[PDB]
Amino acid sequence: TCDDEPIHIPGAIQPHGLLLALAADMTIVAGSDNLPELTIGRSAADVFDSETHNRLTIALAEPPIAVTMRKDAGFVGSWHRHDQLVFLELEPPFFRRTNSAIRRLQAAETLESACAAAAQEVREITGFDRVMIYRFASDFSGEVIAEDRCAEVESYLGLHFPASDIPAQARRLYTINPVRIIPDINYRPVPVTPDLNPVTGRPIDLSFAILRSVSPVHLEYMRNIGMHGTMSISILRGERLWGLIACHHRKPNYVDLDGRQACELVAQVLAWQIGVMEEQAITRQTLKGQAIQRSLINDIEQLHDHRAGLARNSEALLELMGASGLCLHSREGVITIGQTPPGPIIDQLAQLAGRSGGSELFQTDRLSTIIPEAGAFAEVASGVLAVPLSRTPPRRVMLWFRPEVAQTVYWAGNPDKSRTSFAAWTEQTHGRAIAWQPHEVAAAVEIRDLIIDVI
Amino acid sequence: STCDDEPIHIPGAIQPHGLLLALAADMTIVAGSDNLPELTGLAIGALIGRSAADVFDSETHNRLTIALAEPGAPIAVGFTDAGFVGSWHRHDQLVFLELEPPPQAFFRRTNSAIRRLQAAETLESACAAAAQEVREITGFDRVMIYRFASDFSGEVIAEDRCAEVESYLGLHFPASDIPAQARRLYTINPVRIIPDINYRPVPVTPDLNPVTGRPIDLSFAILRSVSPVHLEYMRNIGMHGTMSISILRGERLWGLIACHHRKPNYVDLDGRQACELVAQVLAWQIGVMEEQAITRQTLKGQAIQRSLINDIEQLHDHRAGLARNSEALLELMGASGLCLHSREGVITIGQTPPGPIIDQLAQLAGRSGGSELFQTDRLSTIIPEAGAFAEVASGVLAVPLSRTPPRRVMLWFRPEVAQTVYWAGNPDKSGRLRPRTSFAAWTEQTHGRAIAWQPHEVAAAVEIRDLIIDVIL
Ligand SMILES: */C=C/C1=C(C)C(=O)N/C1=C\C1=NC(=C\c2[nH]c(/C=C3\NC(=O)C(C=C)=C3C)c(C)c2CCC(=O)O)/C(CCC(=O)O)=C1C
Ligand SMILES: */C=C/C1=C(C)C(=O)N/C1=C\C1=NC(=C\c2[nH]c(/C=C3\NC(=O)C(C=C)=C3C)c(C)c2CCC(=O)O)/C(CCC(=O)O)=C1C
């Protein structure tokens, strides 16, 4: 039921800032009940006097911003257009550092040097007590991979977390609204009145609201963890939530707007910088690589036909990919090399192969989670790779697999849930095989590219 | 073409607008700008061997000592208590140090246009945005952006200039105007500013690396003296103040932000600090728009691909099938005609040349450069006798279907277009070497060229084979 809470229409905001919803050919309609007080539906040309309405409205009408109360203070004006009406949020009220951190983020050589640099700067620009960089694995559980922190605050590096610490609907949001901050986690929520879209006749969609009332479930989270000031930035490699810059603080802390814009730009930089390294390991490997591969190709290219060619040098080509066993799978011809799974090799994997192929391949570390009955066969089938020969179908799919490996994984303790406390706790992990990056995959691809020459 | 020979990293001099120091590990300053006599009282032969701190403030002394600790600019050199600007680096094995004379509103202007380049939907909407922003912040009379071609010749593809400033837009430039070595370092030294071009260079004394047997490598120098030829160049062009930024898409010199000014003009560190970022942000978008278009070409190739799947499912000869779909799929990639070359069967669909298509193009095909393709925009160039059929075969694109023997070949043909390109020059008219005196645009109209294939159009053909294969199962 975790992916079921509707967080985007919460009908409230946070007390520190105040916001207004207006009718677009500008008159103002639906009000946040955080701002009527220290300053109901109303006509919009009716804001500070023409200085901050008019010039700021025309810039909003045609194509950030800086903004007369009884109390006479000064606010920050951020906005956006969404579900067809005009939003406007208000919160209370250097350059070298930013560029030099790009300049350092550009020279960083390894994926760790990229992140601990990323982690480094956005702490030095929010002062936050802890700035962790959080990569998602495929199952979208995570691991804090690098970390930069003030002393005396507990350290969470190399630490795995449930996928559940941020649920499914929460994640589209961070895939589309790329940044979020709550300064005090014990803010008493101040409602929006009404929560009626006057336009679409239903609750106030508060999606690109950065003042939005947040989940009490994740409020429960930070009174647990004991950090009362928190912000994050999501990391987007091609519309996919790759990971998160999760910032923390023992005490509440506000980061002002142009101060929060810099934080994000860093993540964007890492979003190529990672993509830089994603691709130069992708060609550092195809080289060594060719030297030995091309050899046992000409040894499989002793093709009067292939099995006497391949399986003669398969005991060599098996050693390439951690091939505990493999299988050839044509609908008619299934050929095993090495250690064999028998019947749901054919139907429960090839149908499993190209369906939701998505034109990309299928690889998995776990099978008892992707096909439940693989649990009995973990000793030879705990993890599986498969490459289509391509149309859906005949879709003749080749596949290599891996046995299970007993690794010990650390956790913010007991992933067994409501949660309570997150001290270090070990789980021995069964039914899991050891992974793949493309010095095996790009080998595997450059296997069947090479094979397909069997014309 | 000695152009590519002149050693430019060791001019033996720096520029007057600042002063430079060369120091070893323990701050024995080795060489110095010959205007340093006017700075501490000592003529240069006396600076030599002296220590750093004495030259300096007690404040500024320590603040460099810490910056050097980390195994990167900018400190301030208030040294005695006026304020200087400290850009440094290690190079050779010694630590260089260059010196320069003396928030928010600057920086809103940055993201306002950082996030502008993020929105840009075309290159030209992006580069009249890059060039626009560079100009808003370095106030240069003219801000051009320069595209490098395959030969390292170039083209002004966008431009922003204040009115009154004569325009070099859409103009081509020879590959000689930036010779080999300049590029070799513009790849690695991404920035250069020369603020006056009739400046009298301040030499460094000595011109010796004490570290090794060399003159002084002024590679990472912002202050290094440039070639006199490139100066006679810009007296000719009529712009007496210039700055360039290198636009690097992944360690290949892609192009250049070349700013110009009628009179001299200076850009402080911050000014061109933000500007190094603009070419950075821009080298990014170029790669996004590049690859975001590979997805919308992969888009419209959908409906008409589905066409020839149903046409090989029905006919099960792909030739019969695809060559029926021929009328459209060779418009998809704007090809004139194509041909399918199986070493056994050559079937020529639409417009195509005869018997030298076979061997003189499939033995030219891929050279067993397995990861490689083949193409041209002129074929009369490479098979000279193809000049005869240059009317139907001027450019070509051609995909293998295997490691040679089997050598299956698909190939797309494009005809000859009379396109008009123009430049300053006289690209043949390019004792010492000497730079051109006139830069008025001459037009040339080109014999035997196809339209430029893009990865845009290439990604099309690329997908075709990768489905023919899918089907053949
Ligand atoms: C299934 C419900 C949840 C469980 C269990 C849980 O632990 N949290 C749950 C719900 C939400 N989390 C929301 C935001 C959020 N969660 C995290 C989790 C982390 N913080 C960290 O510091 C680290 C790792 C170092 C993790 C994994 C983060 C970072 C965020 C974003 C905000 C922040 O910076 O803390 C969330 C959304 C609330 C809302 O937007 O209304 C929910 C519902
Ligand atoms: C055969 C010798 C040379 C001829 C002729 C010539 O024109 N240049 C020759 C050698 C060098 N050129 C150097 C630098 C340089 N050249 C250019 C060329 C252009 N500038 C433009 O604005 C445009 C078009 C709009 C072109 C085609 C540039 C940009 C530069 C760099 C400096 C700048 O921004 O003006 C050069 C290097 C000198 C040095 O810096 O050491 C040499 C040797």
Side-chain angles (χ1 to χ4, degrees):
Chain A
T1 321
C2 197
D3 326 295
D4 303 345
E5 175 199 358
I7 47 176
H8 55 89
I9 48 132
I13 66 165
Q14 311 167 14
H16 67 276
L18 354 163
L19 118 91
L20 303 121
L22 50 140
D25 26 34
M26 326 207 35
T27 162
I28 300 149
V29 171
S32 154
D33 254 17
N34 193 33
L35 39 65
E37 44 196 42
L38 307 173
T39 162
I40 307 213
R42 180 188 67 265
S43 255
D46 180 15
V47 136
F48 307 137
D49 310 350
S50 289
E51 309 221 326
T52 64
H53 196 53
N54 284 4
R55 298 184 191 173
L56 285 56
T57 51
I58 301 182
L60 133 94
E62 304 183 348
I65 222 121
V67 189
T68 303
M69 277 178 188
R70 352 215 135 99
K71 288 187 163 191
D72 92 340
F75 266 106
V76 157
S78 69
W79 61 276
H80 60 278
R81 291 186 65 94
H82 186 44
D83 56 81
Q84 297 308 320
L85 75 101
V86 198
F87 292 61
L88 190 119
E89 318 169 81
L90 307 128
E91 343 115 347
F94 166 83
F95 170 81
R96 311 153 171 276
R97 330 165 32 185
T98 51
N99 194 7
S100 81
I102 329 295
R103 294 166 177 216
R104 183 157 106 67
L105 234 237
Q106 289 178 294
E109 24 202 357
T110 66
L111 187 53
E112 163 61 28
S113 65
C115 292
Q120 185 79 230
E121 169 85 7
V122 302
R123 173 161 102 75
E124 249 177 345
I125 74 186
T126 62
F128 263 33
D129 288 338
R130 193 143 78 270
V131 167
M132 303 162 277
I133 165 69
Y134 189 64
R135 175 177 56 74
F136 297 116
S138 45
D139 26 29
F140 290 138
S141 79
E143 175 191 17
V144 185
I145 54 181
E147 172 185 277
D148 179 87
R149 78 167 188 284
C150 298
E152 296 180 5
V153 223
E154 188 53 28
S155 176
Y156 302 44
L157 190 48
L159 228 127
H160 279 92
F161 292 78
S164 100
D165 301 352
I166 330 92
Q169 79 296 71
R171 293 180 295 198
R172 318 140 198 223
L173 201 41
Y174 305 154
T175 305
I176 60 106
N177 179 29
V179 75
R180 63 219 57 90
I181 186 190
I182 190 136
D184 195 320
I185 79 148
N186 301 124
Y187 80 112
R188 289 287 200 264
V190 211
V192 170
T193 49
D195 24 40
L196 284 191
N197 239 281
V199 169
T200 62
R202 135 146 335 195
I204 300 291
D205 194 279
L206 283 177
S207 300
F208 285 79
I210 37 79
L211 245 169
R212 181 183 38 78
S213 186
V214 310
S215 247
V217 159
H218 192 245
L219 287 183
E220 181 174 331
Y221 197 66
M222 305 295 298
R223 53 108 213 166
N224 271 332
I225 212 61
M227 303 293 139
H228 286 231
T230 151
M231 171 198 64
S232 17
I233 302 92
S234 76
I235 303 153
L236 291 197
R237 301 198 32 75
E239 199 202 357
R240 196 180 182 89
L241 203 9
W242 182 101
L244 243 84
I245 309 182
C247 306
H248 266 186
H249 208 274
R250 289 159 300 182
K251 228 164 68 73
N253 181 29
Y254 295 70
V255 188
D256 70 326
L257 188 126
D258 39 16
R260 297 187 262 86
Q261 273 153 345
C263 289
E264 179 191 21
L265 189 103
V266 174
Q268 274 163 347
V269 176
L270 193 84
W272 13 327
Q273 188 62 213
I274 290 184
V276 161
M277 298 171 200
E278 190 163 7
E279 201 82 348
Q280 99 254 326
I282 251 45
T283 321
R284 127 203 179 178
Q285 102 266 281
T286 209
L287 191 127
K288 198 42 198 178
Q290 293 303 109
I292 130 134
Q293 159 246 21
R294 174 180 38 89
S295 173
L296 50 60
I297 290 165
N298 293 255
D299 275 324
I300 296 178
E301 203 228 335
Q302 176 128 46
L303 267 137
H304 36 303
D305 274 331
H306 46 86
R307 303 122 81 266
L310 77 100
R312 163 182 288 181
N313 283 65
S314 80
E315 316 288 316
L317 95 86
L318 282 152
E319 294 224 340
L320 304 183
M321 337 258 319
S324 25
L326 66 95
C327 132
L328 289 170
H329 155 73
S330 25
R331 318 148 273 165
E332 303 74 359
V334 282
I335 303 183
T336 70
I337 289 297
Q339 239 155 325
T340 295
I345 239 202
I346 296 172
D347 303 275
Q348 205 172 21
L349 277 186
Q351 292 190 302
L352 193 276
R355 300 225 165 73
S356 297
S359 98
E360 300 302 52
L361 71 341
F362 194 48
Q363 65 230 317
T364 191
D365 28 317
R366 228 105 41 238
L367 261 88
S368 52
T369 44
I370 278 84
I371 71 169
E373 48 214 305
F377 271 174
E379 191 167 305
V380 67
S382 330
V384 149
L385 181 65
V387 174
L389 297 146
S390 170
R391 177 174 73 91
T392 49
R395 207 191 307 168
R396 291 182 183 175
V397 162
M398 72 203 326
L399 41 83
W400 315 262
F401 20 85
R402 283 202 182 148
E404 70 318 325
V405 145
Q407 33 172 339
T408 167
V409 178
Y410 281 76
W411 266 283
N414 290 336
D416 298 322
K417 313 163 179 170
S418 55
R419 290 196 288 279
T420 64
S421 178
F422 295 118
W425 160 105
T426 75
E427 210 188 37
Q428 294 307 126
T429 129
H430 21 38
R432 307 210 171 148
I434 100 214
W436 341 69
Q437 280 180 352
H439 62 301
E440 305 159 336
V441 160
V445 178
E446 243 168 22
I447 284 181
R448 67 114 233 262
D449 299 336
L450 278 274
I451 292 183
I452 267 180
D453 262 56
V454 164
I455 284 177
Chain B
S1 172
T2 310
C3 250
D4 302 20
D5 307 345
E6 176 190 13
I8 246 327
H9 51 94
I10 46 125
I14 79 160
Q15 298 183 72
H17 51 97
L19 1 117
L20 158 70
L21 304 175
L23 341 167
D26 329 314
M27 304 3 270
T28 115
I29 136 254
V30 170
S33 72
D34 276 22
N35 54 17
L36 281 158
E38 80 190 15
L39 241 88
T40 40
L42 309 177
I44 20 79
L47 268 337
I48 312 302
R50 282 326 249 29
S51 215
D54 358 26
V55 173
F56 288 147
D57 249 341
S58 294
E59 291 209 348
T60 214
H61 149 254
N62 49 82
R63 298 178 307 99
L64 1 133
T65 62
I66 155 76
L68 278 123
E70 323 257 339
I75 53 117
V77 186
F79 91 71
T80 305
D81 217 334
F84 264 55
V85 161
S87 344
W88 62 272
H89 60 274
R90 290 185 177 73
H91 200 38
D92 285 293
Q93 258 113 38
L94 68 103
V95 178
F96 288 71
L97 194 268
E98 310 174 65
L99 285 132
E100 215 182 297
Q104 273 225 324
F106 168 92
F107 151 90
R108 152 63 173 152
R109 176 167 40 181
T110 55
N111 339 295
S112 83
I114 299 173
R115 289 166 177 251
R116 175 160 136 173
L117 264 82
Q118 308 239 77
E121 216 252 356
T122 352
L123 191 58
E124 292 67 26
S125 13
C127 301
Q132 171 56 247
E133 179 62 18
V134 161
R135 195 154 92 72
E136 302 184 6
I137 82 168
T138 83
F140 264 51
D141 260 351
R142 146 135 118 268
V143 177
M144 310 174 276
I145 134 84
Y146 190 81
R147 172 188 191 82
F148 277 135
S150 47
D151 40 12
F152 297 128
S153 83
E155 182 181 12
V156 183
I157 75 184
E159 157 185 293
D160 187 308
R161 74 292 202 307
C162 163
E164 303 182 8
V165 174
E166 210 249 322
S167 190
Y168 309 2
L169 181 47
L171 245 70
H172 275 82
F173 281 107
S176 95
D177 282 7
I178 291 168
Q181 74 289 90
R183 279 182 281 104
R184 266 128 224 235
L185 66 124
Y186 295 168
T187 306
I188 61 204
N189 177 30
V191 169
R192 63 219 51 80
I193 179 182
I194 113 132
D196 192 326
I197 79 170
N198 301 341
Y199 80 88
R200 300 173 197 176
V202 171
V204 290
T205 46
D207 242 47
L208 258 232
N209 238 277
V211 179
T212 31
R214 357 165 88 242
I216 284 221
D217 212 347
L218 296 173
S219 302
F220 295 40
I222 343 147
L223 268 155
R224 49 163 311 265
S225 186
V226 310
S227 169
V229 156
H230 173 65
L231 290 187
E232 180 183 342
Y233 185 163
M234 308 238 34
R235 281 165 250 140
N236 285 327
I237 220 173
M239 296 296 142
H240 285 322
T242 94
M243 163 180 31
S244 112
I245 308 194
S246 209
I247 319 172
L248 289 345
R249 268 211 88 252
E251 203 193 356
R252 287 301 178 273
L253 201 358
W254 179 99
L256 224 65
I257 312 181
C259 324
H260 276 191
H261 211 330
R262 299 211 291 304
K263 276 313 233 82
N265 185 44
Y266 309 107
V267 179
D268 55 284
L269 197 56
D270 299 274
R272 40 186 227 280
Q273 260 229 130
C275 274
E276 189 193 26
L277 165 100
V278 147
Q280 283 167 12
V281 160
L282 178 95
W284 192 218
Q285 212 58 34
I286 289 183
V288 157
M289 295 190 298
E290 181 166 346
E291 148 197 7
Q292 90 175 348
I294 239 43
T295 319
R296 100 226 180 190
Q297 161 79 61
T298 223
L299 191 91
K300 5 121 51 177
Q302 219 65 16
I304 121 141
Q305 143 254 185
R306 171 183 45 89
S307 173
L308 57 57
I309 303 169
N310 302 255
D311 282 336
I312 306 172
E313 165 253 336
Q314 187 151 41
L315 283 67
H316 4 322
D317 199 333
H318 43 285
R319 290 126 91 231
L322 84 102
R324 158 166 305 171
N325 289 249
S326 87
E327 173 265 321
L329 62 71
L330 67 76
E331 306 165 353
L332 206 62
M333 327 180 30
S336 186
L338 81 103
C339 148
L340 197 154
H341 182 337
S342 181
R343 300 165 304 167
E344 152 199 340
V346 41
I347 193 72
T348 55
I349 321 303
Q351 254 166 318
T352 274
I357 239 199
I358 296 172
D359 316 273
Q360 303 211 339
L361 278 171
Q363 288 192 295
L364 277 227
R367 79 182 47 246
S368 76
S371 109
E372 250 167 11
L373 242 263
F374 189 80
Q375 72 120 317
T376 176
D377 63 322
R378 321 136 272 230
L379 254 131
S380 50
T381 304
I382 288 102
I383 291 179
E385 58 232 295
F389 309 153
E391 188 167 313
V392 79
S394 329
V396 126
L397 181 105
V399 182
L401 217 340
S402 293
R403 302 282 154 94
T404 97
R407 171 107 286 183
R408 298 266 242 270
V409 163
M410 160 189 328
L411 23 61
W412 306 75
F413 284 63
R414 237 196 258 253
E416 160 194 327
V417 204
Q419 319 124 252
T420 155
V421 305
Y422 21 67
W423 8 28
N426 285 327
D428 200 22
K429 319 289 184 177
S430 57
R432 293 148 185 184
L433 344 142
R434 262 190 183 176
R436 313 187 289 279
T437 43
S438 124
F439 285 115
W442 117 355
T443 68
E444 126 207 10
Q445 287 147 349
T446 179
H447 305 350
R449 298 199 174 24
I451 241 66
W453 308 91
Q454 2 231 74
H456 220 284
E457 289 170 355
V458 160
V462 155
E463 290 155 18
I464 289 182
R465 180 173 68 83
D466 294 345
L467 290 179
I468 290 179
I469 295 165
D470 296 18
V471 168
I472 284 180
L473 297 170

